[PDB]
Paper text:
The reaction center‐light harvesting 1 (RC‐[name]) complex converts solar energy into electrical energy, driving the initiation of photosynthesis. The authors present a cryo‐electron microscopy structure of the RC‐[name] isolated from a marine photoheterotrophic bacterium [name]. The RC comprises four subunits, including a three‐heme cytochrome (Cyt) c protein, and is surrounded by a closed LH ring composed of 17 pairs of antenna subunits. Notably, a novel subunit with an N‐terminal “helix‐turn‐helix” motif embedded in the gap between the RC and the LH ring is identified.
By using cryogenic electron microscopy (cryo‐EM), we determined three structures of the DsRC‐LH1s purified in salt‐free, Mg2+‐containing, and EDTA‐2Na‐containing solutions with global resolutions of 2.7, 2.7, and 2.8 Å, respectively. The DsRC‐[name] purified using Mg2+ solutions shows high homogeneity with a sharp peak after gel filtration using a Superose 6 Increase column. The vitrified DsRC‐[name] sample was imaged, and, using the single‐particle analysis approach the structure of the DsRC‐[name] was determined at a global resolution of 2.7 Å, as assessed by the gold standard Fourier shell correlation (FSC) at 0.143. The DsRC‐[name] complex exhibits overall dimensions of ≈127 Å by 122 Å by 126 Å. In addition to the protein subunits, we identified 38 BChls a, two BPhes a, 35 spheroidenones, 14 lipids (12 phosphatidylglycerols and two di‐phosphatidylglycerol), three heme groups, two ubiquinone‐10 molecules, and one iron atom within the DsRC‐[name]. The purified DsRC‐[name] complex showed high stability in Mg2+‐ or Ca2+‐containing solutions. In particular, the DsRC‐[name] particles exhibited stable forms in Mg2+ and Ca2+ solutions, whereas most of the DsRC‐[name] particles purified in salt‐free or EDTA‐2Na solutions were severely disrupted. When incubated at 50 °C, the DsRC‐[name] samples in Mg2+ and Ca2+ solutions showed higher thermal stability and the relative intensity of [name] Qy absorption at 867 nm decreased slightly within 90 min. However, in the DsRC‐[name] the residues αn‐Asp49 and αn‐Ile51 are replaced by α‐Leu46 and α‐Ala47, resulting in the inability of Ca2+ to be stably bound at this position. This is consistent with the observation that the DsRC‐[name] samples purified using Ca2+‐ or Mg2+‐containing solutions showed no significant changes in the absorption spectra compared to DsRC‐[name] samples purified using salt‐free or EDTA‐2Na solutions. Since we found only two possible binding sites of bivalent ions in the DsRC‐[name] complex, the stabilizing effects of bivalent ions on the complex may be mainly through non‐specific binding to the surface of the complex or the residues distributed in the gap between the reaction center and the [name], which may also represent an adaptation to the marine environments where [name] has been found to exist.
Numbering used by the authors:
A (entry chain e), J (entry chain f): 6 to 49
B (entry chain M): 2 to 326
C (entry chain C): 156 to 258
D (entry chain H): 1 to 256
E (entry chain L): 2 to 275
F (entry chain E), H (entry chain D), I (entry chain F), K (entry chain G), L (entry chain I): 2 to 52
G (entry chain O): 8 to 59
M (entry chain J): 2 to 51
């Protein structure tokens, strides 16, 4: 029952679900940005 | 705005404070003559209190005058006793050290002989003043930090004019007694032995010289920032910590992650100032006696930067282009 | 020709030094003693003279270096040397630096 | 000597590394000497913190206090600790500001917080209290600047909360410490002290901007009108500085 | 973590901008709006230094050298590896220094203390600002700023010093240097008095302000007091920073000849006989 | 997995500030690194491409 | 004060007046400024003491 | 998706001021970056284009 | 084994922050080390391969 | 019984198990990252 | 043996940070020493092998 | 023999910290001394043997 | 003789730490001084014998 921030297990579980929604969306945009740049001028 | 405690806005003057006393009987050698200056009282204490004149103080004052007079009499005689020319060239005249051809032997009076005699009285005068600081602390039953800090300054003072010339085997290595000439010596000393910038101890002494001004700006500002909590009464804040010591500590803890105590600040203050001439004395003592060229020492030890660009002005512009023609 | 034709064909003519004067300007004489009560290295400096370049540096730098072929170089050419007597001192550096403000 | 001990490690290089060892020892000595007060670290909840820092606590040093006030060893239990603080944590974790549970200036928290110093007056070399009113002080008088006695006192909101009846001086150092304020009946009841460092003295008035007119009635008082203890000193000075943030909501809220 | 007395001071408020969005502590450090910008500018500037060090070919801290562009580039932007990186790091450094000073304002506002420290730091910032932007602006090129190297920026000082043929003769340098040697003089003696009074010989009572007040009265005949030494002490160091800023801003924008030649006004005064 | 427990020890409004600076630090730093190179400096490549 | 500052203000104004006055009759700005600085310190100092 | 909860942890009025300053400074910075180049300096292009 | 007892000695919050700073400084340093080398500098190699 | 941080014996075990899971995932990414780089330009 | 009593002398939570910093500074320095030598610099060896 | 009494005079904590620091600095110095010499520098000898 | 009375004057703690620092610095100096000489430098001598 460790909680240094006071958030319960369900409270952080639902917050972390949103965090990955932002993280994956940010990564998804980064992938398309990286994919487009590689087609433009590849670095490999 | 809020009152920044920079100038006192009201001064109170009472009976002159003659000072504390104990079984050592300080009052015997005190002058018992006091004066109050309201001009200096705006920023500091206004009482020009009595001075304890002992035998270390008198000998230092008398011998210091002899060094001052011998230098001055020589400078006056250097310009042929022309007072208008002596005043005009006051910043340029000096008592030059002996010529290098004489080594450590006594040179003629006109060729640095009076320099050694004047230096002899200056050495006695400076050491006597240090003994006064040591004796006064012992007779005041306090620590000898004033004497110990002074000894650090004397260390560079002794190295510059007494220790290094002896190690170098020539009295010519001393510093001339002039306003501009000891600046010329300072520049010539750096040029003669390579580049004194690349002396690690000169760099180290600059670190503590910069740190001393940096700390004592920080300590002065912090105390004045907490002087609304009686922070200027540091001693009472050491024996009984008030909110002045807490906020001063927490200001620097929240700024840079660590702080000091009201007593521990002066240990930082004492040691940074004391290390300025201690490292400088070592750097000067190692100059000529060991190294004789510091930039080549830097190149040998691989900390002298290397540049790849060209050096001439023709590589960057033309003479006509600079002149705009 | 390696100096007056350094960059371009500048050259030197009679007008270069005189500039319309019977005696060229910026000529110098040996004001060696300058100081009255001193001798040696103390009698060539420590006074703002015409040749000292507004400094207390030696005023005999032009005489010793540009007329007497004295050694101008003062640095030690390696990291550490044995400072044997007769080597250039800070006084020689002071005189070299005096000539060199003139440059 | 111009010979290298090994490789390119000469006497100049040897002295440099000798100073590196000394400076490292000096830094350790200086930092530990700075830890005589405030440690152990503890956390927001008040329990001792898991982390205490790379430097260990120094050995106890003893101060022989004068005027028969006993000894003092700084590394140890701190008598200046304040209990029953009126604060609550805004977060369950660490590193977050505390929210005062009542009036921050009245409870003495934050900029208004004081420290539990000794409840005795500071004494000079002679032994009598260091800070005394000029009426009690003998031979003292104004030598320069504007005399604040009799001038009205203006608060931070422009209210006139009384006039300066007397000013307390440090006769040991011949320095002005406080100004007594004879609070008007409309604002206060008796006399309140304000430190010289938080009051700006003009030609016709003395202005303190940290404290509004309504906060003078709550300024901490002194037990006696002839001396002020270190505890009363700490409470009085902290109250005025607490007004720099707690006088009105505008000061506490961000300026932009 | 906290201190034994830190809890009662960690209160909400005192920010200049951002409110409670950033108003928290990370470890002992206080993080504000300007603590966020300090972190961004300091980290970006530090990384760009090591990025420039990587392409420079050496990571040796002594030999790292991010130099300003050539004087031909003027006040415009240069290629990032032809001196342009120095311009960005300067922008990051200025942003970090100003944020650091503004962060100190929030810290001392939350503690209800004076703003002397951020003001004193602003003088140090001004001394840096007059060295990196003000003087290059007056001289018309960003190449007049000092490079960002531990030993490379000493060569700039040495060359700029000898750019006026003897830099000791700078009148403002004399005033500024006199303040450094005296600020360390004041620091040594002031630190000694408090230590001497608080640490008497073993077996003897500690001393109060009177004993140190009468010590330099017995020593040098005058004592400026406990409060006065910090007041003159801040002024001595601030004047050291200010006059150092002056001596370099007049070297080249105001004075182009040798600094010894400046003293020619005193030598050839009409009162002096020929 | 159970990485959601990272919010049991790290408070959301103190880490999001931490990553906000860090993410923009990376975004600004990497772009400047590309601008330093002569191959990925899209600003000068437009000039080179247009001749 | 209200009188020492005024006397100090009078001295610095006289120092500026002596600075430009020497430039008009020849001299130089730096030579004139020193006498102006000297006049500010001497006349201002004398006034600050002679009249209070 | 469910990003509306970001205002449950960050103060809306504090964030808006912070992001308003960030957006302008970023906009001013990028504009100055364009002005530093030759290809994307619209002020210089107009002079070059007009004879 | 019993390596989990490191958290009875070390606070999880301070260690995680410690490695987060350390690991990124690792990543930044190593990436910069390769960028110093002429062989592993992928930015210059793109220019060479483009020809 | 001994804990300077206040964590219980079972609380630390739960925290460490997730930490190792994160450690292996971070290491697994690095191994693939190193493997791709080695095929790109081997350093052995 | 009986070396376990070192923890009766040293605080475990202060030694571990001390050795954690020491071990990495050890590891970095030996890596940097190897890189300085021309024989053991694997970055230049890779460049030489590729040729 | 009877040297155990040194711990009645020296604090075990202060000496052990000093001894640990002294031993590594002594060990580092001697390793650095050998590297300076051209006969005991094992890094340069490995290159010589390989060539 | 009866030199044991020196400890009635000198604190054993302060003398022992001073002696330990003095002994190593003295020992290090003599080792360094030998390394400076051309004769007793055992590192250079081993190279010569190779
Ligand atoms: C070299 C070839 C391309 C190039 C290749 C790439 C590639 C490849 C990528 C980028 C990516 C990015 N590039 Mg780029 N990029 C180039 C030139 C540019 C230029 C320009 C003027 O030339 C610009 C402006 C950018 C800008 C950007 C950003 C859009 C983005 C990185 C985001 C970041 O660092 O901050 C983000 C950090 C933040 C934390 C800032 C947050 C600030 C705001 C105000 C915070 C508000 C939060 C508040 C609480 C409100 C919350 C609301 C939420 C929406 C719910 N690039 C060149 C032309 N660029 C990278 C990316 O990730 O894109 C997604 C990417 O993958
Ligand atoms: C071209 C010039 C050379 C140069 C050549 C030197 C030389 C030469 C020296 C220094 C030294 C110093 N240099 Mg350097 N230095 C240069 C560039 C710099 C720069 C810079 C920004 O460029 C700086 C900041 C410094 C800074 C410093 C200080 C760190 C240091 C002096 C220590 C001290 O406090 O002295 C203060 C100490 C004293 C003044 C002497 C003690 C005085 C005695 C005790 C007092 C007696 C008083 C006397 C009796 C008169 C009393 C009269 C009263 C009215 C009664 N240097 C360049 C490289 N530098 C010194 C050093 O090396 O230290 C290791 C030194 O000798
Ligand atoms: C040939 C050399 C010439 C010479 C040429 C110069 C030149 C050229 C200069 C000086 C300047 C100075 N010289 Mg000089 N000078 C010489 C001889 C000397 C001697 C001596 C004993 O011989 C001395 C004492 C001095 C003394 C000084 C001071 C007047 C001044 C030093 C800089 C300054 O004040 O700080 C001011 C600088 C700052 C306050 C730095 C600001 C720091 C910032 C705000 C914070 C830094 C944070 C940073 C990121 C670190 C953080 C990292 C970690 C997290 C902590 N000079 C010789 C003759 N001198 C320098 C000057 O005045 O600069 C203004 C100057 O440019
Ligand atoms: C030379 C050939 C390849 C190369 C080969 C490699 C190899 C091989 C590796 C990398 C690695 C990495 N490379 Mg690389 N790399 C190259 C060029 C690049 C470039 C570029 C623009 O050119 C970039 C951006 C990167 C970037 C990166 C990162 C993806 C990664 C380093 C992570 C680290 O150091 O910090 C780590 C930072 C931290 C630990 C802190 C992160 C901070 C965040 C914001 C904290 C959030 C925590 C918060 C509580 C949320 C928690 C949520 C959890 C899910 C619960 N590389 C070249 C092209 N690179 C190294 C790596 O680590 O891979 C995993 C790796 O092994
Ligand atoms: C009154 C003038 C004196 C002074 C005062 C002063 N300095 C101060 C303060 C005060 C009152 C502070 O409160 C503040 C502080 O907190 O100090 C601990 C500070 C400070 N002055 C400092 C140092 C310092 N002071 C110096 C001098 C002085 N400062 C004067 C003597 C010097 C000199 C002479 O060079 C230095 C180096 C810092 C310890 C601190 C400022 C901390 C700071 O700015 O933090 C934010 C930035 C970073 C953590 C890193 C930023 C990195 C950059 C983005 C990139 C690099 C830029 C830089 C140009 C690098 C150049 C390197 C080469 C030159 C080697
Ligand atoms: C941003 C909104 C605030 C916010 O809430 O986001 C925070 C994240 O904080 C950040 O986004 C860091 C941005 C600070 C950098 C400012 C410099 C201006 C950008 C560069 C300009 C520089 C000036 C040069 C011309 C956490 O959440
Ligand atoms: C580089 C300078 C140099 C050049 C070239 C030069 N002179 Fe001279 N000249 C001198 C110097 C030095 C003096 C001595 C100073 C003096 O007498 O005033 C001098 C003096 C003289 C004098 C004597 C002045 C007197 O006081 O009576 C004459 C005549 C003379 N020059 C003629 C010439 C002529 C004609 C030329 C052109 C060919 C010439 N000089 C070019 C350097 C030179
Ligand atoms: C036109 C360039 C010129 C100027 C201006 C100049 N130098 Fe020189 N300098 C020289 C020449 C030529 C020499 C060579 C003399 C010799 O070695 O006989 C020299 C030699 C020196 C030496 C001797 C160094 C060594 O031991 O070889 C010093 C000292 C010196 N210069 C310092 C300075 C200083 C300080 C300045 C700044 C005022 C300066 N120089 C400016 C041309 C000049
Ligand atoms: C020097 O070297 C060179 C080669 C030059 C170099 O460049 C080296 C580069 C190097 C080393 C880069 C190393 C990169 C690393 C480490 C990558 C870190 C990046 C990471 C980890 C990505 C996080 C993404 C987080 C987001 C974007 C979350 C979105 C959050 C959203 C907004 C959700 C939150 C919203 C809510 C509503 C919460 C719910 C709230 C309640 C329920 C209340
Ligand atoms: C200079 O020399 C040159 C040659 C250049 C050089 O490069 C030298 C290089 C040198 C010396 C390498 C030095 C590197 C070393 C030593 C490697 C350390 C690296 C280590 C050790 C890897 C840790 C990984 C930890 C993670 C990444 C965990 C992930 C954490 C996750 C996220 C779990 C957290 C999740 C939770 C839910 C919270 C916990 C649970 C509860 C709260 C229940
Ligand atoms: C300069 O160049 C030249 C000249 C060439 C030069 O190099 C000169 C070299 C010179 C001069 C060398 C000077 C070296 C000297 C003098 C050697 C000192 C070195 C010594 C003496 C070695 C101590 C070793 C002690 C250990 C390793 C204990 C280990 C203890 C372990 C860890 C057990 C833990 C201990 C406990 C007690 C447990 C706790 C118990 C209870 C709590 C019950
Ligand atoms: C109006 O009154 C009259 C009277 C007319 C007058 O003119 C007043 C006097 C006037 C105006 C002279 C003004 C003096 C001036 C400007 C001098 C500035 C002085 C300066 C800058 C000092 C440089 C630093 C020198 C060092 C660093 C020394 C250190 C050397 C010490 C001393 C060590 C001892 C040396 C020895 C050799 C030992 C000898 C002993 C034996 C051999 C036993």
């Amino acid at each position: 029952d460790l909680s240094f921030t006071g958030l319960t297990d369900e409270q952080a579980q639902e917050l972390h679900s949103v965090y990955m929604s932002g993280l994956w969306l940010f990564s998804a945009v980064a992938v398309v940005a990286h994919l487009a740049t590689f087609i433009w001028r590849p670095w490999f | 705005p809020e009152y920044q405690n920079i100038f006192t806005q009201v001064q109170v003057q009472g009976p002159a404070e003659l000072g504390v006393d104990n079984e050592n009987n300080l009052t015997e050698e005190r002058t018992t003559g006091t004066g109050f200056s309201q001009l200096i009282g705006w920023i500091g204490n206004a009482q020009l209190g009595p001075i304890y004149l002992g035998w270390f103080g008198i000998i230092s004052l008398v011998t210091g005058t002899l060094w001052f007079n011998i230098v001055g009499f020589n400078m006056l005689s250097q310009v042929g006793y022309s007072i208008p020319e002596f005043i005009r060239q006051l910043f340029w005249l000096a008592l030059e050290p002996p010529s290098p051809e004489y080594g450590l032997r006594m040179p003629p009076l006109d060729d640095g002989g009076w320099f050694i005699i004047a230096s002899f009285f200056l050495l006695v005068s400076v050491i006597s003043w240090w003994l006064r600081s040591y004796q006064l602390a012992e007779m005041h039953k306090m620590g000898k930090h004033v004497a110990w800090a002074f000894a650090a300054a004397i260390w560079l003072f002794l190295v510059l004019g007494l220790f290094r010339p002896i190690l170098m085997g020539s009295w010519s290595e001393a510093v001339p007694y002039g306003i501009f000439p000891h600046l010329d010596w300072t520049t010539a000393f750096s040029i003669r032995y390579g580049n004194l910038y690349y002396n690690p101890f000169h760099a180290l002494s600059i670190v503590f010289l910069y740190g001393s001004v940096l700390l004592f700006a920080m300590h002065g500002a912090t105390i004045l920032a907490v002087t609304r909590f009686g922070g200027d009464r540091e001693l009472e804040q050491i024996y009984d910590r008030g909110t002045a010591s807490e906020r001063a500590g927490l200001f620097w803890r929240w700024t840079m992650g660590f702080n000091a105590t009201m007593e521990g600040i002066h240990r930082w203050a004492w040691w940074f100032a004391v290390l300025t001439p201690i490292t400088g004395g070592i750097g000067i003592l190692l100059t000529g006696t060991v190294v004789d060229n510091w930039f080549l020492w830097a190149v040998e030890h691989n900390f002298a930067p290397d540049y790849t660009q060209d050096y001439g002005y023709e590589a960057y512009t033309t003479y006509d282009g600079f002149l705009g023609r | 020709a390696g100096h007056v034709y350094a960059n371009a064909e500048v050259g030197v003519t009679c007008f270069t030094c005189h500039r319309g004067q019977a005696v060229p300007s910026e000529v110098w004489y040996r004001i060696d003693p300058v100081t009255e009560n001193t001798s040696g290295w103390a009698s060539v400096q420590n006074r703002a003279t015409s040749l000292s370049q507004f400094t207390s540096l030696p005023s005999d730098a032009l005489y010793q270096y540009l007329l007497n072929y004295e050694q101008i170089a003062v640095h030690d050419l390696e990291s550490r040397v044995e400072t044997l007597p007769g080597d250039p001192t800070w006084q020689n550096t002071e005189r070299t630096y005096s000539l060199m403000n003139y440059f | 000597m111009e010979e290298t001990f090994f490789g390119n490690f000469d006497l100049a290089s040897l002295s440099l590394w000798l100073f590196y060892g000394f400076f490292a020892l000096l830094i350790y000595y200086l930092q530990t000497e700075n830890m005589r007060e405030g440690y152990p670290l503890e956390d927001d909840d008040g329990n001792t913190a898991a982390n205490q820092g790379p430097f260990p606590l120094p050995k106890e040093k003893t101060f022989k206090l004068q005027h028969g006030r006993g000894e003092l060893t700084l590394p140890g239990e701190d008598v200046q600790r304040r209990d029953n603080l009126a604060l609550r944590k805004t977060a369950h974790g660490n590193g977050f500001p505390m929210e005062p549970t009542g009036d921050p200036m009245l409870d003495g928290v934050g900029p208004a917080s004081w420290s539990k110093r000794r409840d005795v007056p500071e004494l000079d070399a002679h032994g009598h209290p260091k800070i005394v009113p000029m009426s009690a002080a003998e031979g003292f008088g104004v030598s320069a600047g504007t005399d604040p006695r009799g001038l009205p006192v203006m608060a931070g909101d422009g209210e006139i909360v009384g006039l300066v009846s007397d000013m307390w001086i440090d006769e040991a150092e011949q320095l002005v410490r406080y100004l007594e304020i004879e609070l008007d009946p409309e604002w206060g009841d008796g006399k309140r002290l304000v430190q010289r460092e938080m009051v700006r003295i003009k030609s016709d008035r003395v202005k303190v901007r940290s404290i509004y007119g309504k906060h003078f009635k709550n300024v901490p008082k002194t037990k006696s009108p002839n001396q002020v203890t270190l505890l009363e000193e700490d409470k009085i000075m902290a109250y005025y500085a607490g007004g720099t943030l707690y006088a009105d909501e505008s000061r506490l809220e961000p300026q932009l | 973590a906290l201190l034994s007395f830190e809890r009662k001071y960690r209160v909400r408020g005192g920010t200049l901008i951002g409110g409670d969005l950033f108003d928290f502590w990370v470890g002992p450090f206080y993080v504000g709006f300007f603590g966020v910008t300090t972190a961004f500018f300091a980290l970006l500037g530090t990384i760009l230094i090591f990025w420039g060090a990587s392409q420079q070919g050496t990571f040796n801290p002594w030999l790292i050298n991010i130099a300003p562009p050539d004087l031909s580039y003027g006040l415009g932007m240069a290629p990032l590896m032809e001196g342009g990186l120095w311009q960005i790091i300067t922008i990051c450094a200025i942003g970090a220094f100003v944020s650091w000073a503004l962060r100190e304002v929030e810290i001392c506002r939350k503690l209800g203390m004076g703003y002397h420290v951020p003001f004193a730091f602003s003088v140090a910032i001004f001394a840096y600002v007059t060295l990196v932007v003000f003087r290059p602006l007056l001289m018309g090129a960003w190449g007049h700023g000092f490079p960002y190297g531990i030993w490379s920026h000493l060569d700039w000082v040495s060359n700029t010093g000898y750019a006026y043929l003897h830099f000791h003769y700078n009148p403002a340098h004399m005033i500024a240097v006199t303040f450094f040697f005296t600020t360390t003089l004041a620091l040594a003696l002031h630190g000694a008095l408090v230590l001497s009074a608080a640490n008497p010989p073993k077996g003897e009572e500690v001393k109060g302000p009177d004993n140190e007040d009468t010590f330099f009265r017995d020593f040098i005949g005058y004592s400026i007091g406990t409060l006065g030494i910090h007041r003159v002490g801040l002024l001595l160091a601030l004047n050291a920073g200010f006059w150092s800023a002056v001596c370099i801003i007049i070297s080249g924008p105001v004075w182009t000849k040798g600094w010894p030649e400046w003293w020619n006004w005193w030598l050839e005064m009409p009162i002096w006989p020929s | 997995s159970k990485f959601y427990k990272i919010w049991l020890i790290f408070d959301p409004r103190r880490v999001f500030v931490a990553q906000g600076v860090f993410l923009f630090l990376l975004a600004a730093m990497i772009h400047l690194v590309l601008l330093s190179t002569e191959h990925f400096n899209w600003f000068e490549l437009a000039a080179a491409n247009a001749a | 004060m209200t009188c020492t500052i005024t006397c100090w203000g009078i001295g610095v104004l006289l120092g500026i007046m002596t600075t430009v006055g020497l430039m008009v009759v020849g001299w130089s700005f730096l030579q004139g400024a020193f006498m102006g600085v000297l006049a500010w310190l001497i006349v201002g100092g004398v006034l600050a003491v002679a009249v209070c």
